[PDB]
């Protein structure tokens, strides 16, 4: 197999990348072969990169389906009798490089403001989390595939991941130094569009340069049913300690 897919994921509003984890709790990229018979998936789910860009290189020339899944509204959607409503996924030819580009809406976009402070080996930064597509589209999208709740959309935490990587982010998080805050029901509404202050656990020696990223996510997990509640991230940010 020598045809390579090479793809983004991107905000719809925006245009920015959707920042993630090369983890299982990452962007998801499934990619079946289409055939007159039934369809094949050769190559296993893969997961893009931190800066929501993907690449596999080991694919069989031929037509194929392309599905993403992550930390935005689903793409492929169907209801709890398991009837399709929407598939918003890619049908392309991949053949040489194929380039493919997804636009998404993520459920939030998180930023730090400041740059983090450090005192005493433990660090200190603030966070902007911020709906990445209105409650309106939200609602309007899922309520139709049933059992629809409004908690669906609380913000339930805010990670604060530590670590000597610089592909700081769930997966490389350190547990020394990585911290969190949760918000019980819909508690984090009024925080949305404000500053929020976050503080490292532990201490990191002084000298070393560690690497932190911030992340949010909503109660609600993708894909439907699977139980991963997906975290949209910050870039990451250098901080040598004092």
């Known amino acids: 197999p020598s045809e390579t897919i090479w793809g983004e994921v991107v905000d719809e509003a925006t245009g920015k990348r959707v920042l993630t984890d090369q983890g299982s709790e990452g962007i998801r990229v499934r990619l079946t072969e289409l055939s007159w018979g039934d369809n094949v998936q050769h190559n296993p789910d893969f997961y893009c990169m931190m800066d929501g860009t993907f690449q596999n290189t080991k694919i069989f020339k031929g037509e194929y389906n392309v599905r993403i899944d992550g930390p935005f509204i689903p793409l492929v959607r169907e209801n709890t009798d398991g009837t399709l409503l929407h598939d918003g996924s890619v049908n392309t030819e991949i053949s040489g490089t194929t380039k493919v580009k997804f636009e998404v809406q993520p459920f939030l976009n998180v930023e730090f403001v400041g740059n983090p402070q450090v005192s005493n080996g433990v660090i200190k930064a603030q966070v902007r989390v911020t709906r990445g597509v209105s409650d309106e589209v939200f609602r309007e999208k899922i309520q139709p595939m049933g059992n629809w709740k409004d908690e669906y959309l609380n913000v339930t935490d805010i990670q604060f991941f ?76 250098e901080v040598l300690i004092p």
């Open 162 to 237: 530590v670590s000597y990587s610089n592909t700081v982010g769930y997966r490389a998080r350190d547990e020394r130094w990585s911290s969190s805050i949760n918000y019980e029901g819909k508690s984090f509404e009024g925080l949305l569009g404000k500053e929020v202050t976050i503080q490292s656990n532990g201490n990191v020696p002084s000298g070393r340069k560690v690497f932190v990223r911030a992340a949010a996510r909503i109660n609600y997990d993708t894909p439907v049913g699977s139980g991963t509640r997906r975290w949209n991230y910050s870039e990451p940010m």
